[PDB]
Amino acid sequence: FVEDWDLVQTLGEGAYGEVQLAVNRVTEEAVAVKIVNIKKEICILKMLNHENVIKFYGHRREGNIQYLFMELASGGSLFDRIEPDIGMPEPDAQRFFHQLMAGVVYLHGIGITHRDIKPHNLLLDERDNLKIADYSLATVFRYNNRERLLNKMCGTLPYVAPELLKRREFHAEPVDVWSCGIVLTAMLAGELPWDQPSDSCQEYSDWKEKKTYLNPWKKIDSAPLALLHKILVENPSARITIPDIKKDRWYNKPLKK
């Protein structure tokens, strides 16, 4: 198998192609390999250097198949740490949220939007450090200090911001903030609040009407729920920004040893 690397186990599939564990017969160093536009993805992957983003090691083409070598996350995904109908202990949810914001602030700072934040795309290293993975939908929204609005509809319906179903064009950053809000909801309640944030979605109307005696909102303590009230705001220019998320009372609440 490719160069010194043996492809010894599968970690995920479907998507565009498969992800393999690559143990180096020589050094025993273990990495991840994605087996697959791709030009643009590679170019974004080479920009990424942060502790909460999956590191890119290199690519080797071999006829049809490209091979993307990235940092391995041996802890699996945040999706596997969320217990259905329960979620996880509030202190673990807060730490993962801190790491997720650190990663999102980095991407936005280099003018990159991920566009598909959800628990399947948030992986853990062996010390339970969160890493944003899968840059196949990622795009430049800021270049030479000029912002460009996005127009492609993409992501996963339960995680997408409402403006992306309703507007011709929209700002990248509030879309990623919204999906972090759905991720925070899943961690604290082990359930997604709606199929999609459309006015024909009863659960979404129930939330705009502030009916928080229904699930999933009734499983969530008042402090983190006050933050979700500022994140899941339908008007993207009134929605809270990451600088202001970092001032939020629950965000700054001591919880974890």
Ligand SMILES: Cn1c(-c2cccc(F)c2F)c(C#N)c2c(N)ncnc21
């Ligand atoms: C499961 N998995 C993925 C993955 C991420 C998104 C979709 C998908 F299908 C995947 F396999 C990784 C990546 N990128 C990954 C890694 N780097 N290390 C360990 N396991 C991984």
